[PDB]
Symmetry: C3
Subunit: 184 residues, 3 copies
C-alpha cells in the first residue's frame, strides 16, 4: 500500500530534547516517482513544552532507514507506530519493505569527498509558524540522504530553526507539505 | 472519481464582502491518505475589486461540510459549480458523498474544551502574492475542521491576511498548493 | 505513464546564461487533475557558476510546448533527456504525447487583449534558498501558459529573482514542490 505514517493521534513518538517528549505527525504518500509528504511537530513534555530563553532554537529530527527502507532504532522517531496506514492506525506486520518511499540516491546522494559540491536540491527550506501565529516563523529544513550514521542507507531529517524569542510557549508548528523523488 | 473542484473559469462563486463578488479557484485531488489541494482567490466586483485604505486586510472564506462531505449552503462558496470534475466542468449528479476528501478528524479535531490545546497542525500558514507581485505578500491560513457553525461535520477555511497598503488594487493572488490528511 | 522528468543526475541540460551551463532538475508527476511538480536549478559552468556583483539577479528558464505537449527546441531546457521516466533514465521513444501534463488553458489562459486582467492564479511565487542557506532567499516564480513565442501551445517557466549579493557563490537552490491544474 501507498501511505507510511505515524498515525494522526497525539501520542508521543519522538525525541526533541528527551525520549518521547514530542509527537511527530508525518505522512508519506506514494505518488509514483514522488512521495507527497506532510509533517508537523508538537512538544508534549520536557524542555520544548515550555521553552525558556536558553532552550536551543535549532531542533533536528532524524529518520534513518536501512536498505529495505525500514526505520532504524537509532532514529529520533520510534518504530512502534511508524508503518503502513490501516484506518487511523497501522498494519500489524512490523517489517515491510519501503524502498519505493525512500529518497532517490541519484537526486539526493550521500555526503562524500566524491561529491563535486554539497547539492542544494537535497534540501527543502521554508517557514512554518509556531502556535499557528503568523508573526512566529520557524524555518523548516528537510534534508534527504544527508545522514551517514549508524549504517543508514537513506535518511529524511526535519530541522526547525528560529531566532525570535518563543520562551514560555509550547513548541507546536503548522503543517508543511512537500515532495521528493523516490528510489524504486 | 478523484477530483472535487470549482471549475477553472472566472465565473463568480464566492463571497469576500458581498454575495458572488469573487471567484474561488479550488481543486481537491484525492491521493490516497492525502488530498492535494490548489487554491487561489480573485475579487470580480465589490469592495475587494478596488480596495480602499479601509477595506479590511483580513478575509475568511469558509467551506462547511456535512457528514457526507457535501458543502453546506451557509458556506462562502456556492454549491452550484462545486462538484466532481467532468472535463472542464462538473458532473450532473448534485449530491455525491465526499467523505474521502474530508479532513481527518483525528489529525484535525473540532474545537472543544476537551482539547488539550489549540493544535497548530490544524493550520497551514504561508505567503501568496497579491497581483503576482513579489513585493506584495498576503498571508494564507488554511484551517481544517476548526469551524462548528451550522452543524458542520468538517470544514476547510482559507483566510487571507495582510498589512501592506494595497488600496486601488484588485484583490487577486497567486496559486497555492497544499495537502492534508483525509477521513475515509 | 505518469512521470515526465529531466532525470535526477547532474549532467547539464539547461541555459541560464550560456548553452548547457546548468542542470534543471524537474519532475512532473500526473495525479489526475493536477500535476505534482518538483524543481531545482544548479549552475555547473559559466557566469552563474561563480557569480559577480553584476551578474543579473533575475533568471528565467522557459519550457515551451507544442499542442501535443512536446517540448519545443527553442526552450531553455534540452529535449535530449526530458521524457517519460524509465528507472533513473528516460524511455527510448522520443515523441510521446503529453497533453495530460500540460497546464490547463482555462485556468491559465494565454496572454491577450481578450483577457479582463493578468490573472494572478497563473503564477506561483515563493522562496527557495541559495546554497541551502537560510539567510539567502531567492524568489521562485512559476508561470503557466504565459509565453507565446515560437508558436507554443503551452508553457511552464521558472524565474529566479533576488536582491541580496551572492557574488562569488555558485548558483544552486533548494528544491521546490508545486502543483497545477492540467489539460486532458
Amino acid at each position: 500500500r501507498r501511505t507510511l505514517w505515524t498515525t494522526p493521534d497525539t501520542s508521543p513518538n519522538c525525541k526533541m530534547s528527551t525520549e518521547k517528549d514530542s509527537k511527530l505527525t508525518l505522512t508519506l504518500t506514494k505518488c509514483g516517482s514522488q512521495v507527497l509528504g506532510n509533517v508537523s511537530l508538537l512538544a508534549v513534555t520536557g524542555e520544548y513544552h515550555q521553552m525558556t530563553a536558553t532552550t536551543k532554537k535549532d531542533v533536528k529530527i532524524s529518520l534513518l532507514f536501512d536498505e529495505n527502507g525500514i526505520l532504524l532504532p537509532s532514529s529520533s522517531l520510534s518504530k512502534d507506530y511508524w508503518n503502513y496506514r490501516s484506518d487511523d492506525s497501522i498494519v500489524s506486520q512490523k517489517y515491510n519493505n519501503a524502498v519505493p518511499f525512500m529518497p532517490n540516491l541519484t537526486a539526493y546522494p550521500k555526503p562524500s569527498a566524491q561529491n563535486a559540491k554539497n547539492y542544494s536540491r537535497t534540501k527543502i527550506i521554508s517557514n512554518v509558524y509556531l502556535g499557528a501565529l503568523t508573526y512566529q516563523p520557524v524555518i523548516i529544513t528537510i534534508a534527504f540522504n544527508q545522514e551517514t550514521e549508524n549504517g543508514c542507507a537513506y535518511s529524511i531529517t526535519f530541522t526547525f530553526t528560529w531566532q525570535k524569542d518563543y520562551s514560555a510557549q509550547q513548541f507546536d508548528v503548522t503543517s508543511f507539505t512537500f515532495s521528493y523523488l523516490t528510489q524504486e
